[PDB]
Design a protein around this ligand. Structure first.
Ligand SMILES: [Ca+2]
Ligand SMILES: [Ca+2]
Ligand SMILES: [Cl-]
Ligand SMILES: [Cl-]
Ligand SMILES: [K+]
Lengths: 96, 106, 86, 98, 98, 83, 103, 96
DNA sequence: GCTTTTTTTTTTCACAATCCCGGTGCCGAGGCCGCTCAATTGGTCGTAGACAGCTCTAGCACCGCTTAAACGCACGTACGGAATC
């Protein structure tokens, strides 16, 4: 078999069908969506790495994630992102 | 037994996969157990937000599946997404219909 | 190894094609002196982008420039490109 | 004999190409030009086809957008014809060029 | 009654300031701006002295740089006098405002 | 008047002096306000990030580093304050 | 000492520690921080040699930010490396657009 | 007491006395030299970090540094920069 | 204030270009399958960092002098830009 090449494509479909059920996605489109998630992974994870480093901290926490999102995302985009991480962590925490 | 972290967080995006990539990515020595949840949260939000707008431009173009051009129109016509993807080039994307005023006929 | 040395392919970037790119940029009227000037610019873009890709190749010891070589090179020039991996 | 006024077809071309996304440089001429330039830096190199396509996507975009900057620069000096000096200002303010 | 013609002190003032390195904005007014603007993001903030000077080096630097690019646009429109539309163009081309 | 729009504290004389050091000769009247606009957006952007740093570090005192780190993010890297 | 072994003033020890710690890679070769010290040392020297000239050309014994700015902005290559960098108290290079000068 | 904050200054001074043994240096100037060294150290290590990362390698070696330097410094400066990093390693290897 | 033209506006068809549909056909989006290797479970151990307590740094407030800089106003020259060619 060809060597295993991971992607976010199954997650992208799963999200797409939540938003626009009647809607599909071309090979190339999905590849752009992939560049996008990797792009923003690198940026958020990078500014997290920094925040921790700056504060003489060995650990990226969800705190560092949040703050980096405040630095990296424009206005209303950042807010919804801050709420939706804050939801998800809370839900995860009570579920243990 | 066996329930994925992504399910416990109400998430489609993989917390398992994310919490690895942080550790292996030379980002820091340690990783808190919320960090990859939070991050998967944000990547799912942002991903959803682009497919919400892409798909409207998909529908408005009278087609069922999203292609580069739909994404581009959706990114460039949306004030904040365009700022976030300001130094980013979308292949087979093209440009927004824009013709400067003074270039038009009298 | 079965013939590969290259010609003068910068004139391959024809006046028709430069005119079409200017058109996409919403340019209505184009001076005589644009086309040569454009090729200079284009050349200097490509020289810079390929030098860097070619580096990323030579490091991984390959003799084949990958799309990722070009991608990694483009992000380096602050020209991040979506839809060819990474 | 019918004849369209100078600018009326340029304006059509402008709308034709803004609507579209296909690449505007002839794919082989461009490919030959990639290979020619790359020799400078290393000989007997192979390129993935995707690497060459990734280069023509990144090029066309860079110029198409420079031509926007350049058009404003023409119009800023109450002109409609983009001139060499227009590009050069665009590039000097971008900082691509001393 | 000695009277220098328009622009002839300008040039003195250019030569003068280009030779020098000293902040050109008055330090206290600047500082009062930095606190006014800081409030809109957090109340009862204190600043290190050097934080304000780091902010003021950075500001003037940007402004000076923007003026160079502005001058260039104004000269590009066969003019000698900078105007807002020069600033706005140089910012449009810097990718600072859409 | 003389009241709590500290931006106006940025005098015409000081705006003139910048554009001098920037090789400007003849300065339109409208410009001193345009400049004032532009300066604020500049500080807003930098200071928002610098204080975002401050709040993360759990402090009430904005450090010169916080600014340095902000200016790096804005692509305006500054030497000689802790780089 | 290591720096002494490598021909260097810059501390091959210190540099090596900043790499392991500084979240760059899991492991750090024994070459890297030697090489890295050498390059930092090289670049340091070129600026100082050029800025120390700018001081003496202004009859001054101590190098100041202006001397660095002048050294750096006049050297096609150093300018490009530090093209998006601001030197506090550097000032700018005397230069007046031609069409502004009289006649 | 008073913190204990490290800096490249004692080395900036040592190099200065190699290139100009009678010229001195201000604290603001030495602050720019310390800003300069830290800047490029982070530039070269980050580009090495990524090189290594793109080639599935765990070790930054002197080779990663030398590829990062071709990438970051302009032609004529990269040339001397390699020439000096090569020579320093050779000399170090040679000793023990 | 006219008489006589140019300038600008209007209306009438001719023609090209683009637009929109259904028909047709090919191929890649979508999805199912079977197997894998990476995410999960449940455990252990060590230390990173939260936390309370104390030190003393440097940020802030205030005040009272001495200017240097900002200010406002008079005046006119060189500039921006409109108009023509
Ligand atoms: Ca919906
Ligand atoms: Ca189907
Ligand atoms: Cl966490
Ligand atoms: Cl090594
Ligand atoms: K890192």
């Amino acid at each position: 078999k060809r060597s295993r090449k991971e992607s976010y494509s199954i997650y992208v479909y799963k999200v797409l069908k939540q938003v626009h059920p009647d809607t599909g996605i071309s090979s190339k489109a999905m590849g752009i969506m992939n560049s996008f998630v990797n792009d923003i992974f690198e940026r958020i994870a990078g500014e997290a790495s920094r925040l921790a480093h700056y504060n003489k901290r060995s650990t990226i926490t969800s705190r560092e994630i949040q703050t980096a999102v405040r630095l990296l995302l424009p206005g209303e985009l950042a807010k919804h992102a801050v709420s939706e991480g804050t939801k998800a962590v809370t839900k995860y925490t009570s579920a243990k | 037994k066996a329930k994925t972290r992504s399910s416990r967080a109400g998430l489609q995006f993989p917390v398992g996969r994310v919490h690895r990539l942080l550790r292996k990515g030379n980002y820091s020595e340690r990783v808190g157990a919320g960090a990859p949840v939070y991050l998967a949260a944000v990547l799912e939000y942002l991903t959803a937000e682009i497919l919400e707008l892409a798909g409207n431009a998909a529908r408005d173009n009278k087609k069922t599946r999203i292609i580069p051009r739909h994404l581009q129109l959706a990114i460039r016509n949306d004030e904040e997404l365009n700022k976030l993807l300001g130094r980013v080039t979308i292949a087979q994307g093209g440009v927004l219909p824009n013709i400067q005023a003074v270039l038009l006929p009298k | 190894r079965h013939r590969k040395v290259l010609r003068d392919n910068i004139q391959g970037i024809t006046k028709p094609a430069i005119r079409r790119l200017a058109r996409r940029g919403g340019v209505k009227r184009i001076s005589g002196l644009i086309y040569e000037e454009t090729r200079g610019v284009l050349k200097v873009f490509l020289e810079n982008v390929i030098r860097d890709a070619v580096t990323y190749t030579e490091h991984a010891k390959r003799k084949t420039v990958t799309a990722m070589d070009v991608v990694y090179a483009l992000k380096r020039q602050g020209r991040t490109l979506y839809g060819f991996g990474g | 004999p019918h004849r369209y006024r100078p600018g009326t077809v340029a304006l059509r071309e402008i709308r034709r190409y803004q609507k579209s996304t296909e690449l505007l440089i002839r794919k082989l001429p461009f490919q030959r030009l990639v290979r020619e330039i790359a020799q400078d830096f290393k000989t007997d190199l192979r390129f993935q086809s995707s690497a060459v396509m990734a280069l023509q996507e990144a090029c066309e975009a860079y110029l198409v957008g420079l031509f926007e900057d350049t058009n404003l620069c023409a119009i800023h000096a109450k002109r409609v014809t983009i001139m060499p000096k227009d590009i050069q200002l665009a590039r000097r303010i971008r900082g691509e060029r001393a």
